[PDB]
């Protein structure tokens, strides 16, 4: 199962310079990295990343993450993948730069379809 993280290009480059992504401002505040399953990813993008240019989408294989990945019942009763540890740069299967639609919403459609 692939899970996804949406973050700024700055944060991703910063992560690569450290060997791992320790989390966004909200991740660090909450105590875990907020990721989304494929069926929830687009809504996550529409909810918190509107109008942001230079966003990057990280696709991550969930199974090999281990016990630190917890699936917790959250938004709309759906279980969201929460990683209670930094995400290794090596744990990212693939990345992609996102484009915004007319409403300023990041388009994840074609990437999730992969």
PDB file of C-alpha atoms in Angstrom:
ATOM      1  CA  UNK A   1       0.000   0.000   0.000  1.00  0.00           C
ATOM      2  CA  UNK A   2       1.298   3.437  -0.949  1.00  0.00           C
ATOM      3  CA  UNK A   3       0.784   6.391   1.364  1.00  0.00           C
ATOM      4  CA  UNK A   4       1.503  10.004   0.504  1.00  0.00           C
ATOM      5  CA  UNK A   5       3.103  13.087   1.945  1.00  0.00           C
ATOM      6  CA  UNK A   6       2.646  16.545   0.470  1.00  0.00           C
ATOM      7  CA  UNK A   7       5.336  19.115   1.297  1.00  0.00           C
ATOM      8  CA  UNK A   8       7.084  22.178  -0.099  1.00  0.00           C
ATOM      9  CA  UNK A   9      10.113  21.847  -2.370  1.00  0.00           C
ATOM     10  CA  UNK A  10      12.115  23.687   0.296  1.00  0.00           C
ATOM     11  CA  UNK A  11      11.207  21.104   2.915  1.00  0.00           C
ATOM     12  CA  UNK A  12      12.005  18.202   0.598  1.00  0.00           C
ATOM     13  CA  UNK A  13      15.413  19.625  -0.369  1.00  0.00           C
ATOM     14  CA  UNK A  14      16.092  20.291   3.318  1.00  0.00           C
ATOM     15  CA  UNK A  15      15.104  16.702   4.041  1.00  0.00           C
ATOM     16  CA  UNK A  16      17.485  15.347   1.408  1.00  0.00           C
ATOM     17  CA  UNK A  17      20.327  17.398   2.903  1.00  0.00           C
ATOM     18  CA  UNK A  18      19.717  15.653   6.233  1.00  0.00           C
ATOM     19  CA  UNK A  19      18.995  12.143   4.964  1.00  0.00           C
ATOM     20  CA  UNK A  20      15.475  12.174   6.383  1.00  0.00           C
ATOM     21  CA  UNK A  21      12.285  14.230   6.627  1.00  0.00           C
ATOM     22  CA  UNK A  22      11.508  15.078  10.243  1.00  0.00           C
ATOM     23  CA  UNK A  23       8.136  16.598   9.463  1.00  0.00           C
ATOM     24  CA  UNK A  24       6.284  19.792   8.605  1.00  0.00           C
ATOM     25  CA  UNK A  25       5.421  22.443  11.200  1.00  0.00           C
ATOM     26  CA  UNK A  26       2.149  20.668  11.984  1.00  0.00           C
ATOM     27  CA  UNK A  27       3.819  17.241  12.026  1.00  0.00           C
ATOM     28  CA  UNK A  28       6.344  18.415  14.610  1.00  0.00           C
ATOM     29  CA  UNK A  29       3.532  20.046  16.588  1.00  0.00           C
ATOM     30  CA  UNK A  30       1.365  16.932  16.592  1.00  0.00           C
ATOM     31  CA  UNK A  31       4.173  14.459  17.255  1.00  0.00           C
ATOM     32  CA  UNK A  32       3.963  12.437  14.045  1.00  0.00           C
ATOM     33  CA  UNK A  33       4.097  12.817  10.289  1.00  0.00           C
ATOM     34  CA  UNK A  34       0.705  13.236   8.647  1.00  0.00           C
ATOM     35  CA  UNK A  35       0.412  11.040   5.560  1.00  0.00           C
ATOM     36  CA  UNK A  36      -2.626  10.115   3.451  1.00  0.00           C
ATOM     37  CA  UNK A  37      -3.794   6.910   1.803  1.00  0.00           C
ATOM     38  CA  UNK A  38      -4.468   7.288  -1.916  1.00  0.00           C
ATOM     39  CA  UNK A  39      -8.248   7.680  -1.577  1.00  0.00           C
ATOM     40  CA  UNK A  40      -7.765  10.499   0.944  1.00  0.00           C
ATOM     41  CA  UNK A  41      -4.797  12.290  -0.679  1.00  0.00           C
ATOM     42  CA  UNK A  42      -6.705  14.636  -2.982  1.00  0.00           C
ATOM     43  CA  UNK A  43      -8.921  15.869  -0.135  1.00  0.00           C
ATOM     44  CA  UNK A  44      -5.820  16.467   1.992  1.00  0.00           C
ATOM     45  CA  UNK A  45      -4.317  18.498  -0.851  1.00  0.00           C
ATOM     46  CA  UNK A  46      -7.498  20.543  -1.265  1.00  0.00           C
ATOM     47  CA  UNK A  47      -7.783  21.126   2.461  1.00  0.00           C
ATOM     48  CA  UNK A  48      -4.306  22.351   3.467  1.00  0.00           C
ATOM     49  CA  UNK A  49      -2.271  23.156   0.354  1.00  0.00           C
ATOM     50  CA  UNK A  50      -4.418  25.504  -1.726  1.00  0.00           C
ATOM     51  CA  UNK A  51      -2.498  28.166  -3.632  1.00  0.00           C
ATOM     52  CA  UNK A  52       0.928  26.780  -2.785  1.00  0.00           C
ATOM     53  CA  UNK A  53       3.316  26.554  -5.714  1.00  0.00           C
ATOM     54  CA  UNK A  54       6.358  24.277  -5.905  1.00  0.00           C
ATOM     55  CA  UNK A  55       4.773  21.443  -3.935  1.00  0.00           C
ATOM     56  CA  UNK A  56       6.151  17.923  -4.078  1.00  0.00           C
ATOM     57  CA  UNK A  57       4.284  14.648  -3.653  1.00  0.00           C
ATOM     58  CA  UNK A  58       6.113  11.767  -1.969  1.00  0.00           C
ATOM     59  CA  UNK A  59       4.805   8.242  -2.573  1.00  0.00           C
ATOM     60  CA  UNK A  60       5.720   5.816   0.206  1.00  0.00           C
ATOM     61  CA  UNK A  61       5.345   2.051   0.597  1.00  0.00           C
ATOM     62  CA  UNK A  62       3.568   1.623   3.942  1.00  0.00           C
ATOM     63  CA  UNK A  63       4.296  -2.028   4.785  1.00  0.00           C
ATOM     64  CA  UNK A  64       8.096  -1.707   5.031  1.00  0.00           C
ATOM     65  CA  UNK A  65       7.735   1.251   7.409  1.00  0.00           C
ATOM     66  CA  UNK A  66       7.243  -1.002  10.405  1.00  0.00           C
ATOM     67  CA  UNK A  67       5.501  -0.531  13.741  1.00  0.00           C
ATOM     68  CA  UNK A  68       6.101   3.220  13.882  1.00  0.00           C
ATOM     69  CA  UNK A  69       3.412   3.616  11.221  1.00  0.00           C
ATOM     70  CA  UNK A  70       0.048   3.798  12.951  1.00  0.00           C
ATOM     71  CA  UNK A  71      -3.292   3.872  11.143  1.00  0.00           C
ATOM     72  CA  UNK A  72      -5.581   6.058  13.219  1.00  0.00           C
ATOM     73  CA  UNK A  73      -9.301   6.726  12.748  1.00  0.00           C
ATOM     74  CA  UNK A  74      -9.529  10.421  11.914  1.00  0.00           C
ATOM     75  CA  UNK A  75     -11.195  12.555   9.216  1.00  0.00           C
ATOM     76  CA  UNK A  76     -14.634  11.241   8.315  1.00  0.00           C
ATOM     77  CA  UNK A  77     -13.939   8.083  10.280  1.00  0.00           C
ATOM     78  CA  UNK A  78     -11.253   6.975   7.833  1.00  0.00           C
ATOM     79  CA  UNK A  79      -7.918   5.646   9.157  1.00  0.00           C
ATOM     80  CA  UNK A  80      -4.998   7.918   8.335  1.00  0.00           C
ATOM     81  CA  UNK A  81      -1.396   6.697   8.256  1.00  0.00           C
ATOM     82  CA  UNK A  82       0.614   8.470  10.972  1.00  0.00           C
ATOM     83  CA  UNK A  83       4.398   7.894  11.116  1.00  0.00           C
ATOM     84  CA  UNK A  84       5.807   8.318  14.613  1.00  0.00           C
ATOM     85  CA  UNK A  85       9.390   8.847  13.453  1.00  0.00           C
ATOM     86  CA  UNK A  86      11.160  10.783  10.705  1.00  0.00           C
ATOM     87  CA  UNK A  87      10.684   9.508   7.151  1.00  0.00           C
ATOM     88  CA  UNK A  88      13.920   8.279   5.609  1.00  0.00           C
ATOM     89  CA  UNK A  89      14.751   9.751   2.214  1.00  0.00           C
ATOM     90  CA  UNK A  90      15.435   6.154   1.156  1.00  0.00           C
ATOM     91  CA  UNK A  91      11.894   5.162   2.122  1.00  0.00           C
ATOM     92  CA  UNK A  92      10.386   7.298  -0.636  1.00  0.00           C
ATOM     93  CA  UNK A  93       9.511   5.159  -3.661  1.00  0.00           C
ATOM     94  CA  UNK A  94       8.910   8.109  -5.992  1.00  0.00           C
ATOM     95  CA  UNK A  95       8.401  11.866  -6.038  1.00  0.00           C
ATOM     96  CA  UNK A  96       6.676  14.330  -8.340  1.00  0.00           C
ATOM     97  CA  UNK A  97       6.269  18.079  -8.606  1.00  0.00           C
ATOM     98  CA  UNK A  98       2.629  19.128  -8.365  1.00  0.00           C
ATOM     99  CA  UNK A  99       0.652  21.601 -10.470  1.00  0.00           C
ATOM    100  CA  UNK A 100      -2.349  23.653  -9.299  1.00  0.00           C
ATOM    101  CA  UNK A 101      -5.759  23.726 -10.986  1.00  0.00           C
ATOM    102  CA  UNK A 102      -7.886  26.853 -11.524  1.00  0.00           C
ATOM    103  CA  UNK A 103      -9.004  26.858  -7.883  1.00  0.00           C
ATOM    104  CA  UNK A 104      -5.414  26.656  -6.689  1.00  0.00           C
ATOM    105  CA  UNK A 105      -5.902  23.034  -5.640  1.00  0.00           C
ATOM    106  CA  UNK A 106      -2.909  20.705  -6.213  1.00  0.00           C
ATOM    107  CA  UNK A 107      -3.746  18.028  -8.805  1.00  0.00           C
ATOM    108  CA  UNK A 108      -2.994  14.504  -7.547  1.00  0.00           C
ATOM    109  CA  UNK A 109      -5.236  12.583  -9.936  1.00  0.00           C
ATOM    110  CA  UNK A 110      -2.770  11.305 -12.526  1.00  0.00           C
ATOM    111  CA  UNK A 111      -0.118  10.619  -9.902  1.00  0.00           C
ATOM    112  CA  UNK A 112      -2.463   8.571  -7.728  1.00  0.00           C
ATOM    113  CA  UNK A 113      -3.611   6.672 -10.818  1.00  0.00           C
ATOM    114  CA  UNK A 114      -0.105   5.257 -11.174  1.00  0.00           C
TER     115      UNK A 114
END
